Design a protein around this ligand. Structure first.
Ligand SMILES: [K+]
Ligand SMILES: [K+]
Ligand SMILES: [K+]
Ligand SMILES: [K+]
Ligand SMILES: [K+]
Ligand SMILES: [K+]
Ligand SMILES: [K+]
Ligand SMILES: [K+]
Ligand SMILES: [K+]
Ligand SMILES: [K+]
Ligand SMILES: [K+]
Ligand SMILES: [K+]
Ligand SMILES: [K+]
Ligand SMILES: [K+]
Ligand SMILES: [K+]
Ligand SMILES: [K+]
Ligand SMILES: [K+]
Ligand SMILES: [K+]
Ligand SMILES: [K+]
Ligand SMILES: [K+]
Ligand SMILES: [K+]
Ligand SMILES: [Mg+2]
Ligand SMILES: [Mg+2]
Ligand SMILES: [Mg+2]
Ligand SMILES: [Mg+2]
Ligand SMILES: [Mg+2]
Ligand SMILES: [Mg+2]
Ligand SMILES: [Mg+2]
Ligand SMILES: [Mg+2]
Ligand SMILES: [Mg+2]
Ligand SMILES: [Mg+2]
Lengths: 91, 101, 66, 99, 129, 249
RNA sequence: GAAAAGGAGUGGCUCUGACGGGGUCAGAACUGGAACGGACGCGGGGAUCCCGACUGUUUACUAGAAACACAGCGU
RNA sequence: GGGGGGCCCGGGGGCGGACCGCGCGUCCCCGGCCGCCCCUGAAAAGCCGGGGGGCCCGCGCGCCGUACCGACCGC
RNA sequence: ACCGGGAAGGGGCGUGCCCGCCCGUCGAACGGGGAGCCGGCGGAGACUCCGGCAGGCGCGGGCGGAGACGCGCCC
């Protein structure tokens, strides 16, 4: 049976710190506890180990990523633009 | 393209209903060295040392080897499993033609 | 300290590696004092007879019972 | 009865190398006996896993035969790491030359 | 298309005391319980450097074993021989033969090297720079 | 008065950085003969957390070019780098995340990080987590390259200054609120003795130019000029304007 | 908010049931100045107004606060 | 998975050194996991392995501390 | 007196060759560290004495396995 109605994982904070902060943490903290997909394993076993550092619990590969998620949207676009610039260098 | 893949899909299903095959790298090596493999099919994230070995073993046996255009999860989906499949080896085409390749 | 099989016991004696032997009555305990370890063998009194006759004359024997 | 004991070491500050256990002596007495730290055994240079066959004893106290494994890279690589080095070496020679 | 584990093929050893050393397939045993095996002869030590300034230096050491084929990596390279003429089961718990069998493979590998034959077989594979 | 807080920090002792258990200084690979005429190959060994730093670091092993053995480097990690990866350094390296190339060989539009402002200095720009520089244009006749710094300023550098392709990993770090005084205590315990902060108006006049008064208040304008002397240069230094307003573009 | 506020039961003895040798939990008869957390240990409660959001810090030896700090916000 | 094996495991047993059972807990150390961090939790002597190349019996172990005490600081 | 790398900075041996970039036998009686247990004796000492049983560091008189794995040195 569902135990809370809105606060979710921020129920650990009680009545403290105000509504705007707890709203931000629910989104941030859900993201950093998530399981992501090994770009190599192809299995859903990547977990954060420190800010910026992500390890597959199956591959055992270690990767550099975002602070609170595996891939950031700026880095996705950068990788996409860099790839097109290389292929254009090919005659 | 679009006509091309709907044949690759059609053949990949034909083998798994009528015709032998195996899923996995260790079953694929033991068959290629014995000359039972009519085809070998790999995923595009197949580990790089393992892929090098499969191609070398293939050229010695003259076993054709292609590359499926999706992750090891797509290959699992394509032949109808819930688990990732790095290598698929077809032993008898049965009702598939295999010309699609 | 360690225990020993009977055949190894005479060879240590046969090479003058023992310093003193003690016979203990309780099954009889034979204790041999080498440079490194004390060795102990347990035999019935029937068996210890022959072993002691084989006893190296250069190897001091003592007895003990109470 | 009263089974309390006094400290065995030079000082009583209970650091990680000053841990004892308790034991009853043949004169009916409760004695203290130091509990040594147990060193790890060697780990693989490529994977960081324990190397098989070596006991967790400092190698000064193990005979030469006890400190080794009987394979190329015996105590350096974990067996799987050797097989992967062998394949990489052989196959790159097959691709840097003759196509 | 075609089987490749045939007598005369050269393999690289992958596990055991002789990992990373070359060998030949004397015989391709049938398949039953326990899997798939082959009688294999190979070099254990190669001779050392010999300056002009030597019988004790330049000898060869051979091994003849039954090996699992999942522990072998074959090659293109090839090596003709006659070693099947005296290697069937005299190498199978027949210890008395098995010692002397190794002795007559030292001689051939010794003979081959002086003629400068099969250079790719008698050269060492470099590992792990 | 007495010496104020900003005057005491220059002397060292309790205000020196907390460098114990740090991995070392992070730099590009030194430019040498082989890199100038070609390219050198390294392999990513680990991805490591450094004390006091937001972005992670990478340990990369290169072969010794003047002897036998290996050489170990410490790089700031671009996002997407992974253990066991092969990187390249030199004039002939290709365009992949992680590679080190002269900025003159990099096409316009590319994201780069850890950029040298003069050749061979081993990298000093866009090093913090999430940052990058852009390559704007090449001027071939003068051998200069134009880049855009993370502040939005523009700058001209040599075309033989080197860069690493990609952007710095750890991005988004500042978007999580510190909730508690305790989370701020743990952050600055790894850097410097700079926290907590006592306000100047909360002090007595002997301690600060803002101190004293029967109400807490500054008393004069808090815009001080550029040529004010040490001990006097508090508040807002040489401000072009003040206040909160929009309309900036 | 909340132990909100408020209620009821609680000993001794003779027994019964449940859990896979072990304590606990549940129930009943009988009995005692109309007693039972029998010593010991152990919140009084509620309706409001002012100040500071909160945990934290301080005038060692007359000031513990509404003062300082703080996350957040801005220049 | 199932069948058969290898290695580690500060521990237990039997023989040496030399009375018999059964239980609930408590403390201490160890194990495999799981959780947490804008915090990621010393260094070196010393000792050992790998790759490549070149090639049983005797004797001894120096220097310094070691009694006692809350007998200490507050005249 | 205070401050400091930019200095032709030392070793192995056996002549004679060869190798070499540049401090500290300062700083912990809780961190690291080769190896100790039982019994007994005295007015006052004991992991130190005596008896017994050990441990550490020194000095002198190429094979087996299918495999995981099992069974002198110098740079
Ligand atoms: K002053
Ligand atoms: K002053
Ligand atoms: K001043
Ligand atoms: K001051
Ligand atoms: K100072
Ligand atoms: K402070
Ligand atoms: K403040
Ligand atoms: K003031
Ligand atoms: K009752
Ligand atoms: K206050
Ligand atoms: K509290
Ligand atoms: K006061
Ligand atoms: K006060
Ligand atoms: K108070
Ligand atoms: K105050
Ligand atoms: K090695
Ligand atoms: K003493
Ligand atoms: K001076
Ligand atoms: K020190
Ligand atoms: K200390
Ligand atoms: K010490
Ligand atoms: Mg004041
Ligand atoms: Mg003033
Ligand atoms: Mg308050
Ligand atoms: Mg308070
Ligand atoms: Mg006071
Ligand atoms: Mg007071
Ligand atoms: Mg004393
Ligand atoms: Mg010292
Ligand atoms: Mg110590
Ligand atoms: Mg005393």
């Amino acid at each position: 049976a569902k135990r809370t109605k809105k606060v979710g994982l921020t129920g650990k904070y009680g009545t403290r710190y105000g509504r705007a902060a707890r709203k931000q943490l629910l989104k941030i903290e859900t993201s950093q506890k998530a399981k992501y997909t090994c770009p190599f394993c192809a299995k859903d076993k990547v977990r954060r180990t420190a800010c910026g550092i992500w390890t597959c619990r199956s591959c055992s590969k270690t990767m550099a990523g975002g602070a609170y998620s595996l891939h950031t949207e700026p880095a996705n676009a950068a990788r996409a633009t860099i790839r097109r610039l290389r292929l254009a260098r090919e005659d | 393209t679009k006509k091309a893949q709907d044949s690759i899909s059609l053949t990949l299903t034909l083998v798994v209903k009528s015709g032998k095959y195996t899923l996995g790298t260790d079953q694929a090596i033991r068959n290629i060295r014995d000359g039972k493999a009519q085809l070998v099919f790999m995923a595009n994230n197949c580990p790089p040392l393992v892929k090098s070995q499969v191609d070398y073993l293939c050229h010695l046996s003259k076993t054709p080897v292609r590359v499926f255009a999706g992750s090891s999860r797509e290959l699992g989906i394509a032949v109808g499993r819930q688990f990732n499949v790095s290598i698929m080896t077809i032993l008898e085409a049965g009702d598939a033609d295999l010309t699609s390749i | 300290p360690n225990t020993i099989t009977e055949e190894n016991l005479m060879k240590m004696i046969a090479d003058g590696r023992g310093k003193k032997l003690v016979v203990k009555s309780c099954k009889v305990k034979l204790k041999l004092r080498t440079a490194k370890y004390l060795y102990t063998l347990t035999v019935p009194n029937a068996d210890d007879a022959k072993s002691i006759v084989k006893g190296c004359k250069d190897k001091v024997e003592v007895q003990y019972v109470n | 009865a009263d089974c309390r004991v006094t400290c065995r070491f030079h000082s009583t500050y209970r650091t990680r190398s000053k841990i004892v256990r308790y034991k009853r002596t043949p004169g009916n007495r409760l004695t203290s006996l130091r509990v040594k730290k147990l060193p790890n055994a060697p780990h693989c240079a490529e994977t960081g896993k324990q190397i098989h066959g070596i006991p967790r004893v400092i190698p000064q106290h193990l005979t030469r035969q006890q400190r080794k494994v009987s394979r190329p890279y015996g105590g350096k690589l974990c067996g799987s790491a050797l097989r992967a080095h062998i394949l990489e070496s052989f196959l790159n020679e097959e691709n840097q030359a003759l196509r | 298309s075609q089987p490749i584990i045939k007598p005369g093929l050269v393999c690289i050893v992958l596990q055991g005391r002789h990992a990373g050393k070359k060998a030949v397939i004397v015989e391709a045993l049938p398949h039953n319980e326990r899997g798939s095996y082959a009688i294999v002869a190979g070099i254990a030590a190669l001779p050392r450097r010999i300056t002009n300034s030597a019988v004790c230096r330049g000898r060869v050491r051979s091994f003849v074993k039954c090996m699992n084929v999942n522990h072998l990596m074959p090659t293109s390279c090839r090596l003709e021989n006659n070693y099947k003429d005296f290697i069937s089961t005299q190498t199978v718990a027949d210890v008395t033969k098995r010692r002397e069998i190794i002795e007559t493979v030292n001689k051939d590998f010794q003979r081959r090297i002086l003629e400068h034959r099969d250079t790719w077989f008698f050269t060492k594979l470099p590992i792990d720079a | 008065g007495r010496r104020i807080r900003v005057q005491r920090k220059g002397a060292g002792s309790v205000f020196r950085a907390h460098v114990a258990r740090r991995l070392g200084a992070a730099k590009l690979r030194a430019n040498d003969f082989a890199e100038r005429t070609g390219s050198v190959r390294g392999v990513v060994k680990a991805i490591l957390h450094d004390r006091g730093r937001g972005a992670p670091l990478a340990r990369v092993q290169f072969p010794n070019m003047r002897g036998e053995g290996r050489v170990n480097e410490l790089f700031i990690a671009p996002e997407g780098m992974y253990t066991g990866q092969e990187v390249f350094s030199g004039n002939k390296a290709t365009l992949h995340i992680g590679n080190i190339l002269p900025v003159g060989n990099i096409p316009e539009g590319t994201y780069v990080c850890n950029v040298e402002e003069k050749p061979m200095d081993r990298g000093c720009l866009a090093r913090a987590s999430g940052t990058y520089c852009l390559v704007v244009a090449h001027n071939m006749e003068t051998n200069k390259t134009r880049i855009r710094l993370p502040s939005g300023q523009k700058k001209l550098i040599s075309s033989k200054a080197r860069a690493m392709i990609g952007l710095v990993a750890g991005g988004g770090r500042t978007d999580k609120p510190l909730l508690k005084a305790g989370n701020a205590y743990h952050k600055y315990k790894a850097k410097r003795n700079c926290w907590p902060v006592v306000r100047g108006v909360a002090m007595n006049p002997v301690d600060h130019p803002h101190g004293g008064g029967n109400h807490q208040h500054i008393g004069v304008s808090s815009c001080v000029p550029r040529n004010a002397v040490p001990g006097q240069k508090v508040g807002l230094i040489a401000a072009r304007r003040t206040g909160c307003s929009g309309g900036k573009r």
